[PDB]
Symmetry: C3
Subunit: 188 residues, 3 copies
């Protein structure tokens, strides 16, 4: 079992189906960024402590979902042999219930917060912004190729999830959020 | 209060003013990368310990400044309703005094250093390179649209600040820097 | 000694040789991403503990090699004054022996694993995906300019190294890997 095949040494790689693409192709970038997010989520999960244990399981669940998302991003819409498997409905509602819960429990802001606080909250804000980077790449792909739009819906919602969870993480250790000092009242 | 509006589910988003852009638009990428840097800085700040407490306040200050920078990056130069608020002068001189101080105190190198050392120093080198990534995106934007050039000045200087602070962080725990073994004498 | 020259304040910068490029130029991005990887590796190394000490030296070695790689990426192929110095052969075989060893020792999977586990294993998966991001940028450069193809070979192999090392890191603390629940048997 050798994970190195050396077939990518010239800069091309296989997607799902028969097509090979350059490694910088917008599709390869899209699921590559999802993979980087997925690794970051694993890193974030590794920072869980006794105050923040309640977040551990859902972070693992998100990793499972990001594999499902990446699968579809790797799959051309006109590949006869492979189909999209990701359905946004249940995963996205699941995220929304957590955003709702976490928004309700934490102290309310009007103003932008500094992305920071505890190590876990800060890692969740990093997750938030990597998710947003991945989303930009998914949009890049979408503008050139037919994608499963369900992935974009979920990935969009997911960065709201990470924002909400980051604030929740601070709340779980009673670390106050800090406000952006020049912020207008932006959350309504 | 629902932070999820679902208006971005199709890949477009509002900037400051009335314009909507695709999420992968160079402007949205520019302030998105600034936001990722901002989250990283929060993460770096969360790693401060009793040896490195002297760096905590300025890292928070940098977060405030990155919100000011992102505001202007989000604002088209011909938006009648919104103006640039960021002025580079004082923030950049403030960075320069710290670069000066930190450069003076730490052991002098000629040669490239390995970006590493303590956890905080290493996080500061990560900050350095995320700042540089954000700067590249700001330049991408600048080549297509009129930006507040003050933001570029500050963001340029900021990666020098993170280099200097990373070396300072090592010095604060008396962790020696390691040299790149094939380095020419590059700092003069 | 002032590391800030202010010459890049307008968005252009020098490469090796006489050429100046915009900071978002594909070459500047390529070695800039290598620099971000290099900083991440330093961060990963800073997470080493008594269980994982055996990985510390090779991570430092990888930092040395990434400087060698970046040098060549910074060097145009037709620069009369500067030459490529990186040779892939020995560094890449060195990576392969470690991939082999680490693959052999850890429990075998068929299926995709969640990128996660201990803090160090998770950081190694982050390294894996930053390496892959850098590789995409190196390919972007290659499609426009003649590069030292040895760098691409090594950088390709390196993300396999980080995958193998991440699994090894889990094994060193006896943290089980978790499988992607919808994975097909992909490793053969
Ligand atoms: C898509 C894909 C991925 C995606 C998976 C999720 C996604 N879609 O975003 C991502 C980018 C995460 C991935 C990661 C890696 N994968 Co991959 N992946 C593939 C690919 C193209 C499809 C996998 C799949 O779902 N197969 C199942 C069905 C859909 O395919 P089928 O042809 O109908 O059967 C395959 C090639 C293949 N198997 O076709 C490799 C492939 C399985 N993966 C490979 C490798 C090496 C990796 C990585 C180790 C690369 C790395 N160094 O990071 C990691 C491991 C990740 C992990 N956590 O376990 C190799 C396996 C080599 C071997 N000896 O089996 C393959 C075979 C590609 C190759 N030939 O080089 N990859
Ligand atoms: C620019 C901007 C940002 C920037 C701010 C700094 C910068 N410029 O780089 C960044 C990218 C950091 C940002 C982040 C987020 N923001 Co925003 N932001 C905006 C935007 C477009 C302008 C905000 C502003 O300064 N308003 C003040 C003045 C200039 O605007 P005005 O019209 O004259 O009044 C607005 C939309 C708006 N308010 O116009 C949202 C908006 C306020 N933000 C929104 C959200 C959800 C977010 C995030 C939670 C997104 C996320 N999941 O990461 C985060 C929160 C960040 C934090 N730390 O608190 C939502 C708020 C939803 C609500 N119920 O109020 C808005 C309304 C956009 C939207 N309709 O979806 N965003
Ligand atoms: C390429 C390069 C880098 C690469 C090096 C590896 C690579 N190639 O990927 C990277 C991107 C890592 C780098 C990083 C930085 N470097 Co640089 N680098 C250069 C450059 C263009 C070549 C260096 C070199 O190898 N010289 C040796 C030979 C090949 O050049 P020669 O002309 O024949 O002599 C020079 C400019 C120069 N020296 O020509 C700067 C230069 C040496 N570096 C500079 C700086 C400031 C930096 C950083 C501090 C920037 C930052 N804030 O992150 C960091 C320090 C990194 C560290 N760990 O020590 C400045 C030094 C200023 C001074 N007072 O000496 C220079 C002179 C560029 C400039 N004029 O602004 N850079
Ligand atoms: N740099 C990269 N960024 C994102 N995705 C990649 C990258 N390289 C390959 N891929 C995708 O992820 C899968 C696994 O990567 P892998 O390294 O095995 O591919 P490869 O580089 O083509 O092969 P090899 O590394 O054996 O030469 C590939 O089949 C491809 O779909
Ligand atoms: N992926 C992204 N990367 C960077 N910036 C973004 C991204 N998506 C939106 N933005 C910018 O940041 C602000 C807040 O993001 P937000 O998620 O609220 O926007 P949206 O995705 O358009 O809306 P929603 O998530 O409610 O559907 C936006 O108004 C826009 O200026
Ligand atoms: N944002 C960036 N991303 C990646 N590489 C960069 C970036 N800016 C400069 N470089 C490269 O790295 C080297 C060091 O960066 P440095 O900040 O010293 O350059 P500069 O911005 O042109 O100068 P200064 O910061 O003094 O105005 C440069 O010579 C150039 O090769
Ligand atoms: K491989
Ligand atoms: K939102
Ligand atoms: K500089
Ligand atoms: Mg959104
Ligand atoms: Mg500079
Ligand atoms: Mg490969």
């Amino acid at each position: 079992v050798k994970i190195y095949t050396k077939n990518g040494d010239k800069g091309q790689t296989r997607i799902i189906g028969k097509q090979i693409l350059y490694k910088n192709d917008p599709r390869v970038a899209a699921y590559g960024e999802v993979d980087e997010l997925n690794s970051w989520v694993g890193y974030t999960k590794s920072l869980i402590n006794s105050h923040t244990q309640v977040l551990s399981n859902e972070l693992e669940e998100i990793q499972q979902l990001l594999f499902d998302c990446g699968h579809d991003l790797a799959t051309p819409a006109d590949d006869e042999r492979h189909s999209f498997k990701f359905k946004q409905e249940q995963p996205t509602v699941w995220l929304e219930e957590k955003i709702d819960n976490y928004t309700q429990v934490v102290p309310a802001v009007k103003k932008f917060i500094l992305p920071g606080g505890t190590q876990l909250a800060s890692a969740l804000h990093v997750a938030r912004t990597i998710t947003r980077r991945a989303e930009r790449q998914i949009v890049q792909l979408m503008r050139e190729e037919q994608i499963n739009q369900d992935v974009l819906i979920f990935i969009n919602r997911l960065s709201d999830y990470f924002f909400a969870a980051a604030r929740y993480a601070n709340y779980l250790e009673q670390q106050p959020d800090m406000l952006y000092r020049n912020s207008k009242d932006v959350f309504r």
